[PDB]
Design a protein around this ligand. Structure first.
Ligand code: BCL
Ligand code: BCL
Ligand code: BCL
Ligand code: BCL
Ligand code: BCL
Ligand code: BCL
Ligand code: BCL
Ligand code: BCL
Ligand code: BCL
Lengths: 59, 59, 59, 59, 59, 59, 59, 59, 59, 59, 59, 59, 59, 59
């Protein structure tokens, strides 16, 4: 049976190799949700400007 | 019956020889189960990150 | 100053028109987050399967 | 921004497609440990046969 | 004095214009300090591995 | 200063890249001390075959 | 340093080796001392043949 | 096995040489953060100047 | 049997000769583990420079 | 029966002559077991060196 | 005196440079005294062999 | 001072080398005193043969 | 046995001769350690020139 | 039986003659052991030189 021992490893590889693909498989998501944030501020800064609730109507 | 005494020795040699094959018949297994341990870790690092169980719901 | 009264309506237009863009702007999101849900199921299944916590060690 | 909306579906696809690879990924392991079983029986049968422990030495 | 009134505006501009330069003058810093974090982890994962402080020497 | 912002990213790189050299660097050691245990056994086996300490001289 | 990792294995060798030399080395001794016990008998038998001590002289 | 002993020293070398890289690796950081300091003073000086808080309104 | 007494002396040899191979077979190891100690020092020097543990958080 | 008396002496000769063969028959054994001795010392010298039994575990 | 500021840095050098020379100036000594220990042993093995002091003269 | 370090050794050598000369310096003495022994027995065997002290003269 | 008495004198020689090699052998060591004491002084003199310990800080 | 009386004198001879051989036989020994005493002195003197035992450790 000497030589030809190429099975057994593979499993070690499927486990080890998969580490590379799964590791760089995340980094992409980070900015997706976060980047937007700024774009909604400009509409907010105009139309709205008077925080003062003021007196209550009918009282 | 002098000469021709080749039997008794085979039994000595059917046991002794078997020592060579059996001895190098176990080393293969060692790594099989082991090596894998590393691969499953990356998935577990990302999705899971907050050990903090937090407070109990409804209490 | 008969005629030449093409201002005023622009305001009506910008306000009215903005409805067309903004009312087609949203629809894109919806599916974005929702579709995913079907990819994580196939790894969760196989590696896990025994809900039975079993007895507590040391007791 | 009519058309050109081919980004959102990739996540849907990665989440989906991944299902095909992972679902055929497993089946290989099943027979890996189970097949063996039969091979160890033949040696056990010959060198062992008298279940009868017999009497205890010195008593 | 009619016409030639180009001064007063510069002040409105020196203040308004500076808004553009100062606004895109911060975004650069964000990643500088943060990105590094990851690189120092690998030396930490090897040489170190046994959290268990163990028993106290001389006691 | 538009473009030419190649400096900051290097830090991200020195930290991130070093992650490669260091990770591959440790694997060499594991086999080194371990493989030896087998060679010392045969000498030990012949000269030392009697465990029975026997009686104490002078008593 | 990819490839060129042929040292760490010599030790695995050397120790793994040596098993072969040492193991076939001992078999020589067994017969040396034992085969002799059959040559001393023929002189002992003829000159000596009367176990009977007989009576004690002077008594 | 006279000669051919060029392995052992590699460890000594990797351990020793690594000193050269790492002892030149640093140095770059030092000035990075410190320099800046002088740039923010010029704007703070002109728009601010009256330390005297003065009296409190409504008292 | 005058002359031809070349056996016996081999044993005197095999024992005596082996003294040579075994004696010059251990010296290799000495440097192996030792030499390394120096290389781990530089990383340890920079990142860690403040021994002062400081005060205890929350007290 | 004068002369021809060569039978009586042979016994005297067999008894005598045998002295020569038996006398030089021994000397060979002397160094057979004694020479070895030295060859086993070198392995003992290395792998063992700390006579100090040290403290007893668990006490 | 813009430009021509090459002094101060020499002092920065001269001290830093001296680190290289002094660092690789001690490693030479290590083996000097050590290596000798083995040589004096052979004379001491032969002439002296009987640790047993024996009885005291005149008593 | 790189290279030319051939002094520090030598001592290691005079100490080591001397082991070879001193080790084979002995051996010769062994048989010098011991071989004689036999040559004095033949005169003793003749001339003396009557251990019996016999009776004491004058008593 | 007239003449040929050249063995007994070798011992007288070996012992008498070795007197020559050993006698001139030692003279080498003397200078080795001693000559050094003069090179360490110069660095000691400049950096350290104030013996006066001075007052104790905090008292 | 006049003449031919040459026997009786041989005994006188053999006995008388043996004096010549045996008398010159001994002289060889004398120096053998005695000359050596001058070779051991030159190693004893350099390595040892301080007769003074000094104080006893721990007292
Ligand atoms: C005992 C159960 C073990 C296990 C046992 C196994 C076994 C057993 C096997 C795998 C295999 C695989 N495992 Mg697994 N695996 C485990 C855990 C995982 C998990 C998980 C999240 O739990 C996942 C998703 C993976 C992922 C994977 C894949 C890498 C692979 C299935 C085919 C594939 O996609 O390769 C896609 C691509 C590759 C495998 C890389 C090689 C592709 C080459 C051949 C393409 C041609 C190359 C071209 C000619 C040259 C140019 C290429 C470039 C330009 C350089 N494993 C579990 C815990 N795994 C199989 C495998 O390794 O493939 C044989 C396999 O036999
Ligand atoms: C938000 C977090 C989501 C997630 C979001 C993402 C996002 C976002 C992306 C991925 C991507 C991927 N995800 Mg995901 N993913 C999740 C859950 C999973 C899990 C999991 C176990 O939980 C795993 C392991 C996967 C697995 C995968 C891979 C299929 C893929 C990474 C590259 C790759 O290996 O494709 C290897 C092979 C392919 C992708 C198939 C296409 C390969 C083609 C381009 C090769 C050339 C074809 C040739 C020219 C034509 C001939 C081919 C044949 C002969 C027909 N995802 C998590 C829960 N995933 C990335 C992706 O889909 O790639 C763009 C990606 O952008
Ligand atoms: C994991 C630990 C497991 C284990 C797992 C393994 C693994 C893993 C392997 C073995 C293998 C073997 N094991 Mg196992 N084995 C276990 C228990 C046992 C026990 C025991 C008493 O406990 C024994 C003695 C055996 C016995 C054996 C042998 C059958 C075989 C080693 C080579 C050999 O001798 O095949 C001699 C002959 C054969 C294997 C039959 C095939 C021979 C063919 C190739 C010769 C040429 C054929 C010719 C071209 C065509 C004409 C032929 C005829 C004329 C028809 N195993 C333990 C419990 N065993 C190995 C094996 O099965 O070989 C691949 C192997 O890879
Ligand atoms: C703030 C402190 C941070 C840190 C901040 C920095 C900073 C700041 C810098 C580095 C730099 C480096 N860091 Mg760092 N670094 C940290 C942690 C580490 C640790 C550690 C184990 O803790 C180490 C040893 C490393 C290792 C390294 C090196 C990769 C690099 C020093 C030069 C070098 O060796 O590049 C050798 C080789 C390269 C850098 C790759 C590029 C080489 C090219 C230019 C050669 C020519 C290419 C040729 C023309 C094209 C063909 C090439 C091939 C055939 C394709 N860093 C700490 C935690 N590091 C410096 C750097 O990245 O270089 C400028 C740098 O400026
Ligand atoms: C760390 C301390 C370890 C140890 C580590 C080492 C290290 C390290 C090394 C050795 C080496 C050796 N060890 Mg070790 N070894 C240990 C334990 C043992 C013990 C013991 C009883 O404890 C012994 C005596 C051995 C015995 C041996 C020798 C086999 C070998 C020294 C040279 C030699 O004799 O090779 C004699 C012959 C051979 C090695 C076989 C190869 C000879 C070839 C090169 C000759 C030419 C072949 C020709 C061209 C082709 C035709 C040949 C045939 C016709 C087919 N080791 C101790 C416990 N050992 C060295 C070694 O193995 O050499 C590389 C080595 O590197
Ligand atoms: C037992 C565990 C030990 C250890 C044992 C090992 C072992 C074992 C090895 C290393 C190796 C390495 N170790 Mg280490 N090492 C330890 C501690 C450290 C620490 C640490 C911070 O603790 C670090 C990060 C280092 C860093 C390093 C690297 C220098 C090297 C991995 C490849 C490399 O980067 O070479 C980058 C470049 C070089 C090694 C210099 C030589 C490059 C040449 C070959 C390129 C071609 C030259 C060209 C043809 C000529 C022109 C060149 C110039 C123009 C003059 N070690 C740990 C504590 N280390 C390996 C090594 O050094 O490779 C042999 C190695 O064998
Ligand atoms: C009574 C039991 C005794 C004992 C009895 C014997 C007996 C009996 C024999 C051995 C033999 C051997 N014993 Mg032993 N031996 C004992 C104790 C030991 C111990 C031990 C650590 O206690 C060990 C490991 C050894 C080691 C060895 C080996 C040296 C040798 C087996 C072959 C070999 O390896 O030679 C490898 C190499 C050589 C033997 C050197 C000669 C090789 C030549 C022939 C190769 C060709 C030379 C070429 C043509 C010319 C160029 C060469 C160079 C370039 C100059 N013995 C036990 C305690 N030993 C056998 C032996 O000595 O060989 C005949 C043998 O017959
Ligand atoms: C610090 C004090 C150390 C010490 C330090 C030193 C130092 C230092 C030196 C010596 C040297 C010597 N020491 Mg010392 N030595 C110590 C302990 C000992 C002890 C002891 C019993 O404790 C003894 C007696 C020895 C013995 C010796 C001698 C081997 C040698 C003096 C010349 C000589 O005899 O070489 C006789 C022969 C040789 C040295 C072998 C080489 C001869 C070659 C050059 C002749 C020509 C070769 C020819 C051209 C080629 C063919 C040759 C063959 C046919 C193959 N040392 C003490 C404890 N020793 C000296 C030495 O080793 O010489 C350099 C030396 O420098
Ligand atoms: C009884 C125990 C006695 C003792 C008895 C013996 C006996 C017996 C013998 C020795 C012999 C030796 N003893 Mg001693 N010896 C004792 C004490 C000592 C001590 C000691 C520290 O106590 C030491 C280390 C020595 C040292 C020595 C060596 C000089 C020599 C072993 C070979 C050798 O090295 O010669 C190396 C070199 C020489 C001997 C000089 C002659 C070399 C010539 C033959 C080389 C060729 C010359 C060339 C053709 C002409 C050109 C030469 C020049 C250019 C002029 N003895 C003990 C106390 N010793 C042996 C001896 O004297 O050699 C026969 C020997 O037989």
């Amino acid at each position: 049976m000497s030589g030809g021992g190429v099975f057994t490893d593979i499993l070690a590889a499927a486990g080890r190799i998969f580490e590379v693909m799964v590791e760089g498989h995340w980094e992409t998501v980070g900015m997706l949700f976060d980047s937007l944030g700024k774009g909604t501020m400009r509409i907010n800064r105009n139309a709205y400007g008077s925080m003062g609730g003021g007196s209550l109507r009918g009282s």
